[PDB]
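Q: Hi! First time asking for a complex rather than a single chain. Here are the components, and I think there are four in total. Is that enough to go on?
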Amino acid sequence: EYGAIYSVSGPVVIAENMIGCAMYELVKVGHDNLVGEVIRIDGDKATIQVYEETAGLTVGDPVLRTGKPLSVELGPGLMETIYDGIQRPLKAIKEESQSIYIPRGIDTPALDRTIKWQFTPGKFQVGDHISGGDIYGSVFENSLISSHKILLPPRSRGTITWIAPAGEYTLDEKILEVEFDGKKSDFTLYHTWPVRVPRPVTEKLSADYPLLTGQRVLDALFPCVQGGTTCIPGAFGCGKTVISQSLSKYSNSDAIIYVGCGERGNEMAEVLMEFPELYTEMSGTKEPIMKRTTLVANTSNMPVAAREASIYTGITLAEYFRDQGKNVSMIADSSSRWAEALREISGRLGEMPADQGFPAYLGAKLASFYERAGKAVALGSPDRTGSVSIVAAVSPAGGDFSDPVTTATLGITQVFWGLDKKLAQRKHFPSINTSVSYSKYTNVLNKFYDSNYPEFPVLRDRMKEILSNAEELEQVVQLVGKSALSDSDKITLDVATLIKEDFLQQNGYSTYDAFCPIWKTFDMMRAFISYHDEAQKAVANGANWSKLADSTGDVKHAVSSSKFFEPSRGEKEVHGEFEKLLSTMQERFAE
Amino acid sequence: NYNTVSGVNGPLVILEKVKFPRYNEIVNLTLPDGTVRQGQVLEIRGDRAIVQVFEGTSGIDVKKTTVEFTGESLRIPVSEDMLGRIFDGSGRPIDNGPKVFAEDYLDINGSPINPYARIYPEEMISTGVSAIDTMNSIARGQKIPIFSASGLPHNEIAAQICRQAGLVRPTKENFSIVFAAMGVNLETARFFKQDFEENGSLERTSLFLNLANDPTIERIITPRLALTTAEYLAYQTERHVLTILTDMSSYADALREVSAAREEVPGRRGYPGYMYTDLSTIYERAGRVEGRNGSITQIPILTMPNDDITHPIPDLTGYITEGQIFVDRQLHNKGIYPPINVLPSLSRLMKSAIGEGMTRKDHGDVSNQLYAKYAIGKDAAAMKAVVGEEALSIEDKLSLEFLEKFEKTFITQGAYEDRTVFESLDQAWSLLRIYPKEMLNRISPKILDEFYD
Amino acid sequence: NYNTVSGVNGPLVILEKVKFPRYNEIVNLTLPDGTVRQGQVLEIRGDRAIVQVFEGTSGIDVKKTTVEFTGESLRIPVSEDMLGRIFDGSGRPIDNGPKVFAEDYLDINGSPINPYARIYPEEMISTGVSAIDTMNSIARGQKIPIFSASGLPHNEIAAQICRQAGLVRPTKDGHEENFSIVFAAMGVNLETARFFKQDFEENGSLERTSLFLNLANDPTIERIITPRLALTTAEYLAYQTERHVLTILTDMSSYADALREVSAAREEVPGRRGYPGYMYTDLSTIYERAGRVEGRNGSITQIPILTMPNDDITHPIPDLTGYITEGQIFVDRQLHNKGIYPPINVLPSLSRLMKSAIGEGMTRKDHGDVSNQLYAKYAIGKDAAAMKAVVGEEALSIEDKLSLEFLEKFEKTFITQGAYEDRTVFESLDQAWSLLRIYPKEMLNRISPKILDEFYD
Amino acid sequence: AFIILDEVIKVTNRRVNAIEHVIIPRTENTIAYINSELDELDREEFYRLKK
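A: Yes, that's all I need. Here is the structure of the assembled complex.
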């Protein structure tokens, strides 16, 4: 039933004859059809909350209800398209309206219906039993990834009758006719799924598949498996954007879903400008990085409803791409903005705050957002495997860990990597605190990595204990002195300084130091462990520290070059150097 | 079945044209999309009624929805076939098995044990841990909680306890436990599942699993179903019932959320005012029944927010349950085996399992002496860290080394390693030998002469 | 004219018999004594409608009162000739100048800038102050907050900045059209406003700029709506007129109390310390009006100013502008009580966009390095000042004494500029090098060899 | 004078140790408890006002 507003209070508008509409349902208010959301419902008069400006909306103006909740369009035409918190293209808005500003009440489609695509039935014929999630065909979207699989939409089970494949059609055209228990039904290449409801899958599983960060320290210290969850600081000027971009580019995942909450205009503009500049490095060079990825940007001026629920939409899209059986990743920048927007939404909902101005559903929403990720098997006949790697950033107001956002982030995410501004001010590579770094996923990742016998965990724990001993030695150096220590302590300190230079530090600006392969990092840790073991063996052999440090300098200079020389196809070249280190030991057994 | 509904606000529901509604009555809600959601009645006034929706009011039409009222209160399908089978938070089977046949339909709220009919905790048990034996004893049928912190090996400690429980107990009929989770993590769920699988007790135990993805109402109702199950096991089945509950913090925050959503008058820290009694509902349900064999031993597990022992959660937990086992993050970063703080951790009655006729009369005095030496060692550690190592007396350094050895040896054993009570008492006797003769004033001459080699 | 008004409580009143009313609609309220009081609709319902009289309902009998419905919301008279005229919170005359002829009318609500249409900071922006344009650099499209305090002459600083803004780009080699400056007053004293207008007319920048003055005696709605008016004015000279614009807001705390009263007008339950929970969005609807547009030569920059209550940075306002805006300019009460020029602490002073506002082609290659070196000299000089106050000056070391002399000099020379004093970036760098000349060549570890070789002479 | 300097250095080290884990921890804990009490009181007042 068409609604008519009988009351307007601030952003909130209550409309009678709304009995047909439901709770938490989107609606178009006024003659301008402004975007709004129904909060409560009393009899035939529902109380709705307009996310846009309430100016211009008057009495007597018919209010049309969508009849459903907030959703999004998953399918072809979604990729290589920038979107807002309301899931609308900015570039198409600037192309059509030809304005630098976005008018209130304006609306545009997320996926282009004016774009013709060539679709073809892959593994679906007429008479075969299929269900929701089962691929009914394949249509090429981006220029990088293989043709995007068009699958039978959820809550649809039956036998196919008339297939419109193969052929050229838009996203607004039905590509199939399915016969269910409800008799005749229509199905298209594009589908619509709720933003508050995660994408349906067949079975849930645990993720043993490690995701490649490309960074040495990231893959070694705090490795994040594909499907796993990791968190970090949202401090500006700490060079977080470089780490994020490098992580997105060197990721082993098929696609990347970036969902922003809110930030300064300069930062958002910088990210938007630097986004399309990235190029692929798989098949030499495909299209831009924006083609095989999705971007959702919301500034500070954006609505709170388009902020807190933006992560839901982004995760919905990421899971939608994961519903096609492809590993993806969800990046969230400045989640504290979404938390504050959730606080303002809590104040707008009249819900009594819990602590420090946080809402009641805070922990529930956080856990709900954290449980959407992971590696699993999607629904349908296809039975394709997929994953979603969650990555979030927290930028608290006061910076204290006592804040609800920080506690919830640390609690939900099993992996927390701190970003220290001083570490970035140390004239070093990407800033991470070695002391505060911890992960609970180490066990499964180690057990899984042992299958290929690529074992970081031994050298990881060894270098960890070495880092602890070096930390104690550093505490003792600031207490008594650095010249009062023993030979083992000095060797440990030198190894600590060496590991923080040619190992931990990796320049993203260079070619071979940009992305460190698993074999590269493993060989690096192996060579380092070999050097430390050779030094420890030479220390007990009766060799002087000075003579050893003088004689083994060539080994250190050769080991320092193991971060370069490109491609690891000849990784054995490093092993020889390790043998040379053993010769260095033989050089310590002579002089 | 009434198809009439009036208003809708937030996560709640209000209906009219009904009468004689029952408090917390089972009600079936059929939505416009055909979705069937279970719900309980909140309050009833005149010809109008108000109830709370478990699955949420999201996506529900007002005039297109129908509601069927059973009129009976909250009812659960308890049976003797629940053993070995896993159940979800909504009561539905999580083991993907067929329809479970209910032996009896009973209220999940649980019935408080009568004071005269209530029997005091007695006998003893072997948890396989020295701290769970010497420092703080654990009676069979008694109720003690476990206070841990986020990031700590709480799941590992709980797994070790559950695994070594029935194994060590036999050295004192196998012990039967119950696993219950409310709004927990999927990773912790997998860890707990692998733990129950490794322990092999899953066949002799029942599991109630409420995911965090699931609603808060189901998670809160999981504890009730587990309570009714354990009660039916410790009464009708006449067997020993161990109660293992996890993620109480999530249920607490969810309870505060439900309290705030109804705009009810909040208590301390924004929580509910009935929270104390709400916890005391399942807290005082534990105990022994006179004339009835078997007992229900409550071993809850909770996590203090931001590792704060001053948090309202731990305070209310201690105000409800009698005694608790505290886990400090200070010893958790030491790399040593699981971080139990002897000072904060204590048992309600440690004198029930002590004395002659049970195990030995040298238990309690050695516990008091060890606690005294440990506390003195802690104070001496603070003083040594303050003034210096040369500013402390001999007894200070002695108690310091004794406490350090107690932490490195006695406190650190292993997860898969279950230490016998005899081994614990022996290790304690060897630990007291480290201290001087005049060091322990809490020990008697006979025990001092007997224990000293 | 509507006599159907049901009742009046405080500044807000309710009126029955309304048809097709809108939100934030303008209305003319004629009082019983014949007094003319303007008003704006706060809310509307199916039965009655609630509005708010800026002059108040005091002395207005609802029986003899009349209410004329305009049928339109708050709008602004944008024009290219708008520069040089002074207005008030309601858009009415202030300095008793003429009536500005509008080129086009626009909405006060305005519209947000598209994310893909946003352009990053490129051109540098000269502040003109020795402690501002040097330490933390500012560029077009950057949000730089100004933190003042009680008893702090933020007015004179604002006037000095406005005076230094006109000559800020003589060196740019956009010249024909003078850059537009926007002066906005909210809840300001009579003396401060008088001095502001006097200095504006004396500097001669009053003709090339625009002034909107809302005093404390004026209604809160006027001061609250003043910001939107100035924002729309700056927006009209950017997206349409395509010209460089600069926005300046004074006493944002008074506007915060005004917005608090406006929020209390809806009888809504206040948040922590009596402040709206939507205040974050309110500031997000303000500071987001600054930035660079892609394809547009004209850029708009905004530099708001707010006084911290009870000399505390813990205030909700500062915390709100902190994570939103990039960098913040604080004020040291000690240096202000030291009888010196503007007391901006170099330690607290920072800018995130300062990296794009310096360098070759922007300002100088010696800018950032000498800035960090000067800041380090002030900090280490402060530490050495604390150390010398302990064991005495006999324990003073080489670098310690050097940092002491450098700190004293920079405090008595570099930091001190003046009220009407405006120094060029070249003069600032020259003074910086001259002040750093007291230290040796090896005394600066923050300087590069090439720069030092191409500078020192 | 060197011996007296050693004693004074010992007193200074003791004062530094007293300013490390003693005064700092006490002040931090007190500030935390006071902040909690103030926030709780403000929350109660805001709850009463909301009621």
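A: The two ends of chain A are 95 Å apart (CA to CA). Let me know if you'd like any chain examined more closely.
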